[PDB]
Write a protein that binds this ligand. Structure first.
Ligand code: C8E
Ligand code: C8E
Ligand code: C8E
Ligand code: C8E
Ligand code: C8E
Ligand code: C8E
Ligand code: CA
Ligand code: CA
Ligand code: CA
Ligand code: CA
Length: 576
């Protein structure tokens, strides 16, 4: 699709969004045959994701060079629950079987959404309009197994129902470990089992007035090393929507409750984390000329259990923000903007804002200037942990960005450079065994994308340069590749749909924890290749297969944790 929602909360056509943005749909994923959300995001511009091995293992998403907690991940609009305890997003446990759509807008959006939107935003949408029931599942190269039953149907005039179950499981391959593990080893394939359940009830009172109720949860258990971690999550949403010709409005609610254990192996000696986050937001938008204007109020409650986050007492964190959005188109120029004020139960008030203007100085070509401001809340652990500091302020970012975007000779392209200066970075002082706000980073980047067709061939290429450094010491930051290259090539032929995807993961610096003291290591970086194919046996059956890492490239995204290697997958789906 070409109209997202994530930018200002309500539908608008992407072309109207001045910030770089990307959309992935459910048809994409099925094609891509992704078995995990990281797989999907790893493909898109500006994304650098690392992982302690295969599937289920902790992972980190760095967008355009920012720390891993500097990305806001929303599910169906709402701040990712899993991110709550740690103050940092990791989709590693989120069920891909719930993903219907994803919308990703890079750059700051705190001025719309609050804390965490620094690098950009990620909005995983779990909703579809696609009636019928579908059965599917697959088999693969490490006992990977999956099966899943889905269906959406009508329940009479104006009400529709959605139901879904899915179970995927693939014991692993040992992810060695290094640094961690200590004395012995872990000669054991570290599996992950995920079982999901999802149900939605959508209701139109009228042609404009709508309503819904969803409920979903998953029970995961993905063993790691140097320990089996068992995770339960459930979330609940319900809202009303009015969508008129001129006036749009939404009122939304949600509650998610998570329980994240790790044993064992076999009680006593295990840290359970438990969070309950409560959200209510109200937002309006109206069409005004060739533009819109908008505002909403947005409230949050997160309360944690004692022991959670390795923090002494339970905590009850509250936040309320209020913001204003605008888009106007005039003549050849475009203006878009937002401003927010947030009142946090801990640090108080902090406001934020962004503007961008574009000039289409010649048909099909557009020059865009953006300046935007964002923030990142301190987390429990910096606040109330053994080394805590309850008076921390938020970490603060300023970004400037220029772009040229245009359609020339059958090819759509864009090229941006941004600068991101982060400040008040929450860092630990050995001197006082406390955290304080003090660090700086400067990030210097370049994104270039392009898609275009040449015969039955479709190309979708992207390139990123990230110079992310500690601004005081002038040194590169770790865990981040300076350069990635991503290319997808799609084409059909006889009745076979093909896709080859190529990635080059640049060279990164990390640390070697196997042993103290902990030395920095330079990882060379590689090229990876996956190949995929599907074929409609009938009109109802489609069979696919995939070779991932088609050559057998050995590499790590995190020093010491072994990655998959070449895996095979054979899969199918049956719609009726
Ligand atoms: C009705 C409020 C519209 C602006 C809300 C966000 C504005 C935040 O800073 C924007 C101002 O700085 C540049 C002003 O010129 C264009 C503002 O953006 C036009 C919004 O469509
Ligand atoms: C919706 C429009 C919001 C406009 C945001 C941009 C304007 C921000 O003003 C200046 C930013 O820094 C604010 C402090 O102003 C100067 C502080 O000087 C006094 C120091 O004690
Ligand atoms: C309708 C809600 C309006 C939200 C706009 C405020 C967003 C944050 O303010 C703009 C950026 O921050 C500038 C404010 O910082 C200066 C604070 O000045 C406070 C002096 O009381
Ligand atoms: C940084 C981006 C620079 C953009 C320069 C584009 C300027 C003009 O580009 C296209 C102009 O059209 C001429 C190219 O071929 C014309 C095709 O039109 C067919 C009949 O005239
Ligand atoms: C308008 C898009 C800028 C195009 C990037 C390639 C051309 C660069 O020209 C000079 C190179 O600048 C060196 C810095 O490179 C990274 C800087 O990125 C953004 C920091 O301002
Ligand atoms: C990129 C400079 C040329 C002007 C834009 C060309 C359109 C780019 O589309 C292709 C992008 O795919 C890889 C681009 O690599 C070229 C630029 O990398 C330069 C970094 O300074
Ligand atoms: Ca192991
Ligand atoms: Ca193990
Ligand atoms: Ca035009
Ligand atoms: Ca120091």
């Amino acid at each position: 699709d070409t109209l997202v929602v994530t930018a200002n909360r309500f539908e608008q056509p992407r072309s109207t969004v001045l910030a770089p943005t990307t959309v992935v749909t459910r048809q994409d994923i099925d094609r891509w045959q992704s078995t995990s959300v990281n797989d999907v995001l790893r493909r898109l511009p500006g994304v650098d994701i690392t992982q302690n091995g295969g599937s289920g293992q902790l992972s980190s998403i760095f967008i355009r060079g920012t720390n891993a907690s500097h990305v806001l991940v929303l599910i169906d609009g709402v701040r990712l629950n899993l991110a709550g305890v740690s103050g940092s997003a990791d989709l590693s446990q989120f069920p891909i079987a719930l993903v219907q759509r994803v919308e990703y807008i890079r750059g700051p959006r705190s001025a719309v959404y609050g804390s965490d939107a620094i690098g950009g935003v990620v909005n995983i949408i779990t909703t579809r309009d696609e009636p019928g029931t579908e059965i599917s599942a697959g088999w693969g190269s490490n006992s990977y197994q999956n099966y899943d039953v889905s269906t959406q149907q009508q329940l009479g005039d104006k009400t529709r129902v959605t139901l879904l179950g899915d179970y995927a499981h693939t014991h692993g391959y040992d992810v060695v470990a290094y640094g961690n593990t200590g004395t012995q080893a872990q000669t054991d394939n570290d599996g992950f089992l995920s079982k999901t359940l999802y149900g939605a009830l959508e209701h139109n009172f009228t042609d404009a007035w709508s309503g819904f109720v969803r409920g979903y949860g998953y029970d995961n258990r993905t063993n790691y090393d140097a320990d089996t971690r068992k995770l339960y999550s459930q979330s609940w949403d319900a809202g009303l929507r009015y969508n008129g010709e001129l006036i749009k409005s939404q009122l939304i609610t949600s509650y998610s409750h998570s329980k994240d254990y790790n044993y064992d192996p076999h009680d006593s000696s295990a840290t359970l984390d438990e969070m309950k986050q409560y959200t209510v937001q109200w937002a309006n938008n109206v069409i005004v000329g060739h533009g819109s204007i908008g505002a909403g109020v947005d409230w949050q409650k997160q309360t944690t259990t004692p022991g959670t986050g390795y923090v002494e007492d339970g905590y009850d964190q509250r936040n309320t923000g209020i913001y204003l959005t605008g888009l106007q188109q005039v003549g050849d120029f475009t203006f878009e903007g937002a401003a927010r004020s947030d009142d946090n139960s801990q640090f108080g008030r902090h406001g934020t804002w962004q503007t961008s203007a574009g000039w289409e100085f010649i048909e099909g070509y557009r020059f865009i200037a953006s300046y935007g401001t964002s923030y990142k809340a301190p987390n429990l652990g910096q606040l109330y942990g053994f080394y805590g500091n309850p008076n921390l302020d938020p970490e603060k970012s300023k970004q400037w960005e220029g772009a040229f975007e245009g359609l020339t000779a059958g090819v759509n392209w864009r090229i941006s450079g941004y600068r991101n200066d982060v400040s008040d970075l929450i860092d630990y002082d050995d001197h006082t065994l406390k955290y304080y706000n003090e660090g700086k980073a400067r990030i210097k980047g370049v994104e270039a994308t392009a898609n275009f067709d040449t015969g039955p061939l479709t190309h979708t290429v992207s390139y990123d340069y990230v110079d992310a450094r500690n601004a005081i010491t002038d040194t590169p930051l770790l865990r981040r590749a300076k350069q990635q290259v991503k290319y997808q090539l799609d084409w059909q032929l006889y009745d076979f749909d093909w896709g080859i995807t190529y990635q080059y993961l640049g060279t990164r610096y990390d640390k070697d924890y196997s042993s103290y003291p902990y030395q920095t290591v330079k990882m060379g970086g590689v090229s990876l290749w996956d190949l995929a194919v599907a074929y409609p046996v009938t009109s109802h059956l489609t069979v696919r297969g995939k070779i991932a890492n088609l050559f057998d490239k050995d590499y790590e995204t995190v020093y010491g944790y072994q990655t998959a290697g070449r895996e095979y997958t054979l899969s199918g789906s049956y719609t009726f």
